[PDB]
Write a protein that binds this ligand. Structure first.
Ligand SMILES: NC(=O)C1=CN([C@@H]2O[C@H](COP(=O)(O)OP(=O)(O)OC[C@H]3O[C@@H](n4cnc5c(N)ncnc54)[C@H](O)[C@@H]3O)[C@@H](O)[C@H]2O)C=CC1
Ligand SMILES: NC(=O)C1=CN([C@@H]2O[C@H](COP(=O)(O)OP(=O)(O)OC[C@H]3O[C@@H](n4cnc5c(N)ncnc54)[C@H](O)[C@@H]3O)[C@@H](O)[C@H]2O)C=CC1
Lengths: 313, 337
């Protein structure tokens, strides 16, 4: 199964499902990217779900895109509930163009569907020679630190920066202890789950994933603050639903998700030598790899290197 | 020892001018330290004055910095700080970011070659008081193992955020990227007391419950804090062409030498994206709704992020700021260090 195989497979199915071929090819690209890195939970597995939402109009197959520039370094892509992968990619293209010319770009994606493993979009920026940051809202699923009711979602944050040649450092994290898609992956095989992952309906940590009501924020109050930040930057900033108002995947397959995403792109030229920047990123990656491992680890990886390796295999 | 804000400020300002800083630089430095103490961030409060005085005295902090604000684009700049006091340089840089975001919507401003700047949420609060979103981050003394590692590379590399609500309301969030800040290991050293095994590691990279056996801190949330401190080093260090990672200076390396630290501010004007009135209403709504969430057993209340410190700060304005008595005794002395 080659990368070109599934792309064409997914491109075909989604195009049959309603999307323009170009929109279908893009969603395909992002899904193929995800499987390889062990983020299978955002890969070809979701194709059938996406195909459905497309069929029923809960994802716009004919979006009226409007890129509204708001300043020399800012814009909003009004996405009309297009597939998140298409909308986020398109907005990142604008962010890259803007940072290329004017040094920095802050671009909001306003009203999109699920955009997936969001490190795909920051890799776009790094491939263009720039620093990329991205973050987005997600289905309410997480208790506030100390709480028993859900408010924010798993609200991810991603970052990538160019090293020398084709090297890129890519980092991508959910703001919960663990992503949701391995609570079900441990709900499939009847396992106990660790008590750090989730709480019951009373907000008490649980080992029974069938009694899981909500996820816990990573590092307690810190993950809590981070998912708040992401909600404010990609949601409140754009005047979108926020916090517990954010839509859930299964609320209404006929209704647009109205999610927000925010890209920030920085051109190293506008700060220092890009050649030295890239040299120093590669040096960072080398030096971290050479760090003495602690007992229990065979090696130290630079951030994201574990996924970089899985992708190549 | 509870003391008021005007008096703690005056004392710190006096002691740092005595060391050799200009009075207005000392005032700014004092401003940021009393802010930290009032919010309960004591490890970046008045406790640092004695250290600051020695470094100013010995020339490791520039009492006569040649500031140069290099504007690099419509929304970008670098304040070359010539190893000025960190509080002075970071605030100065944030003033430019605010001006820039007012006019052009967004600002990304580096602080290039500064001393320690303290509790960095001070700077993002500047932005929020101006009606803007503020983000800041900076490099710190190498002290932390990479995830899976047994050697030091990054520092406690903090991240701070603030956004305005209605009226005078501000939502402020401010975190070290380690499990715990270094001051908690130091506090355990003062009290002779077992620390949890999740904070820190010995010289072999084995977690230790003995604060005197600590060689390095662990990153918050394993690989996630690791990635965050990397991001911060790249954004506030590598991006600015500064020493990075393990190259970053340590506080007691050379008291006669400039720290050469970096910090990065990012400021976003909500008016360039949507209704700023609705934005502020929505921040205030966020704060109210979170505070109203049903608490888990054990907790009396759910706080919105940073609310614990807002409460301490509110209590500080009434009852006064707490500092350790020995710091007061140093401040009213003629002794510098
Ligand atoms: N609504 C949405 O679109 C959402 C998407 N997501 C995505 O799901 C994924 C979730 O990721 P997590 O489960 O939190 O990832 P994770 O916990 O497995 O790892 C986080 C980061 O640290 C790196 N890392 C992990 N172990 C490492 C090691 N031993 N050495 C060096 N680096 C290491 C990873 O490569 C990754 O960059 C992300 O791609 C995220 O974008 C997550 C939540 C919501
Ligand atoms: N070189 C430097 O300048 C450095 C400065 N620092 C500073 O030191 C401080 C480090 O902070 P940490 O020890 O990580 O803080 P922390 O762990 O006590 O809490 C971090 C954040 O979460 C909030 N929070 C904590 N508990 C909460 C609760 N129950 N409910 C709601 N919110 C809660 C806090 O208000 C704070 O905003 C920061 O002010 C940071 O700027 C840290 C490292 C380096």
């Amino acid at each position: 199964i080659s990368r070109e195989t599934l792309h064409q497979l997914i491109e075909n199915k989604l195009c049959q499902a309603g999307l323009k071929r170009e929109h279908a090819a893009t969603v395909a690209e992002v899904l193929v990217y995800a499987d390889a890195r062990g983020i299978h939970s955002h890969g070809a597995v979701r194709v059938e779900y996406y195909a459905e939402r497309i069929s029923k109009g809960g994802t716009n197959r004919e979006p009226e895109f409007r890129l509204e520039e708001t300043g020399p370094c800012s814009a909003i892509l009004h996405a009309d509930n297009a597939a998140g992968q298409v909308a986020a990619k398109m907005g990142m293209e604008h962010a890259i163009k803007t940072a290329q010319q004017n040094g920095v770009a802050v671009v909001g994606i306003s009203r999109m569907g699920h955009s997936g493993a969001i490190s795909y979009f920051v890799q776009q920026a790094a491939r263009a020679g720039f620093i990329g940051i991205s973050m987005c809202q997600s289905d309410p699923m997480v208790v506030p630190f100390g709480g028993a009711e859900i408010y924010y979602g798993t609200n991810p944050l991603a970052f990538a920066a160019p090293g020398e040649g084709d090297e890129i450092l890519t980092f991508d994290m959910a703001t919960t202890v663990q992503a949701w898609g391995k609570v079900l992956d441990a709900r499939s095989r009847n396992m106990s789950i660790p008590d750090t992952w989730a709480v019951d309906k009373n907000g008490v940590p649980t080992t029974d994933p069938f009694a899981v009501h909500a996820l816990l924020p990573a590092a307690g109050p810190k993950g809590y603050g981070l998912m708040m930040m992401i909600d404010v930057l990609s949601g409140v900033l754009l005047g979108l639903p926020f916090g517990r108002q954010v839509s859930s995947m299964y609320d209404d397959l006929h209704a647009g998700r109205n999610l927000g995403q925010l890209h920030i792109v920085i051109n190293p030229n506008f700060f220092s030598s890009s050649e030295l920047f890239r040299q120093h990123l590669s040096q960072t990656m080398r030096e971290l790899n050479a760090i003495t491992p602690a007992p229990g680890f065979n090696q130290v990886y630079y951030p994201g290197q574990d996924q970089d390796i899985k992708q190549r295999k």
